[PDB]
Amino acid sequence: FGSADDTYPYLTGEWSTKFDYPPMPFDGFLFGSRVMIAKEVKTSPDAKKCIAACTGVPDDKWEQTYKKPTGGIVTVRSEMGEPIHKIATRGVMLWKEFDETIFNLPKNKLVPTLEAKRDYIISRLNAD
Amino acid sequence: IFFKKDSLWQSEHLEAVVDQDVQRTCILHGPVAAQFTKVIDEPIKSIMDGIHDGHIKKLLHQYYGDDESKIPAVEYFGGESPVDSAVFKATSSTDEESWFKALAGSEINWRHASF
Numbered sequence A: 001f002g003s004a005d006d007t008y009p010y011l012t013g014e015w016s017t018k019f020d021y022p023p024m025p026f027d028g029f030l031f032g033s034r035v036m037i038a039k040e041v042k043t044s045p046d047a048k049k050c051i052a053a054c055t056g057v058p059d060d061k062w063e064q065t066y067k068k069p070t071g072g073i074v075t076v077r078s079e080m081g082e083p084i085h086k087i088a089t090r091g092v093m094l095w096k097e098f099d100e101t102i103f104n105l106p107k108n109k110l111v112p113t114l115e116a117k118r119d120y121i122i123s124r125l126n127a128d
Numbered sequence B: 001i002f003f004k005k006d007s008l009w010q011s012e013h014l015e016a017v018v019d020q021d022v023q024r025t026c027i028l029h030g031p032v033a034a035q036f037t038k039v040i041d042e043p044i045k046s047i048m049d050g051i052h053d054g055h056i057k058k059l060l061h062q063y064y065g066d067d068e069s070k071i072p073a074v075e076y077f078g079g080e081s082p083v084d085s086a087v088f089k090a091t092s093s094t095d096e097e098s099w100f101k102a103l104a105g106s107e108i109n110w111r112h113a114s115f
């Protein structure tokens, strides 16, 4: 959610109608992303600029975050392996690549794969 | 652990990132709410008010015939949990909840809140 407008049908209870269900009204709404640009969040200048310029995507196509960048946003896994929704910056996409290549591997294949990529790994750190 | 450790704080301090390159940085955001996020550096009071205010118009139109006179009113708003002259003598057995509702009054005012 981001505006009063898209949020309204969930207040009327009219949203649930698209699915042939009785009107199903809600009591309130929370806005997480929508506020990240506000004059008073500590989000850095260049970062607010980055956030805006992300084209969104309808609920129609959010599933694609799992694979490609989708509206400028990918999922990426934390150190613990739980999914995280991040802006698809260069660093984040490296993090995603390592997520798929290096961190992916069994703890047995770790140290060998690192050494065979040491030059590459060390380079991509320094760049992105 | 060296890679992913403590990696949320750069979004807010790019002066300490390699060369202030946001493109190196973890920023969190939703794919669907991203489309509604456009107006940079807009005061938070505005964003929130923008939503409430907009809900208020749509609501007025639909169920109030755009007449603000039709909106019922009350002294102060809130304090509701999701669930002319008299004398109350009190005993051991008097229900506390019932008792206060009496002294509270039905009209929402200073005496209602006082009890």
Ligand SMILES: Cc1cc2nc3c(=O)[nH]c(=O)nc-3n(C[C@H](O)[C@H](O)[C@H](O)COP(=O)(O)O)c2cc1C
Pocket: A001, A030, A031, A032, A033, A034, B027, B028, B029, B030, B031, B032, B033
């Ligand atoms: C940058 C960022 C940091 C967040 N930190 C927390 C947190 O510390 N605890 C929590 O229960 N939810 C946290 N959330 C989840 C939001 O509070 C909320 O559930 C979600 O952002 C709403 O989705 P939306 O941004 O698409 O409106 C965070 C979301 C974002 C984008």
